[PDB]
Amino acid sequence: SGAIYVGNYRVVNRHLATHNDWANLVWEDSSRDLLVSSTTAQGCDTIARCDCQTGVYYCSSRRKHYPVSFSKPSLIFVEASEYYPARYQSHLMLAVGHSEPGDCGGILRCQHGVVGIVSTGGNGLVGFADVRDLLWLDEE
Ligand SMILES: NC(=O)[C@H]1CCN(C(=O)Cc2cc(C(F)(F)F)ccc2Cl)C1
Numbered sequence: 727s728g729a730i731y732v733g734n735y736r737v738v739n740r741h742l743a744t745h746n747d748w749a750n751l752v753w754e755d756s757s758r759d760l761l762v763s764s765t766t767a768q769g770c771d772t773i774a775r776c777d778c779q780t781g782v783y784y785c786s787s788r789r790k791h792y793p794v795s796f797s798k799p800s801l802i803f804v805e806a807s808e809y810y811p812a813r814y815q816s817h818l819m820l821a822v823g824h825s826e827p828g829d830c831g832g833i834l835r836c837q838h839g840v841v842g843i844v845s846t847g848g849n850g851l852v853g854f855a856d857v858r859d860l861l862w863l864d865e866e
């Protein structure tokens with residue numbers, strides 16, 4: 727579990743969005759596993775606006791933050807799970823690291839701010855849904 731809080735927005739994994747998120751929807755994209763809902767109070771996370779390929783992510787299944795190298799956002803085949811059939815997920819970045827289903831939502835951060843959130847895993851890999859291209863998160 728986990729979310730990004732920027733301005734009057736809450737960014738979560740689409741597959742983990744609550745009834746309250748759908749009842750206050752801003753934008754969602756099934757192919758990216760992202761959903762953004764509106765909030766009453768202002769958030770303080772800063773979104774990174776960069777091309778960094780190294781950062782640190784939080785892994786709830788280990789209660790630990792790990793430094794990682796990760797690939798550039800791409801269209802990657804993701805195996806079927808209980809939330810989606812087998813499909814290409816877009817804007818996804820992979821790293822070598824531990825990830826379990828409940829780790830989705832963990833933040834990946836570089837020196838510039840929040841890069842994305844854990845969205846995929848298995849086989850000793852962890853995938854992150856990129857949020858750096860969502861420039862509108864910084865306004866309105
Ligand atoms: N974005 C997606 O398609 C997500 C939705 C939920 N997803 C998962 O459960 C994938 C997953 C599998 C495993 C494994 F290998 F142990 F089975 C470990 C971690 C994760 Cl995140 C994909």
Ligand SMILES: [Zn+2]
Nearest residue numbers: 776778836838
């Ligand atoms: Zn950066």
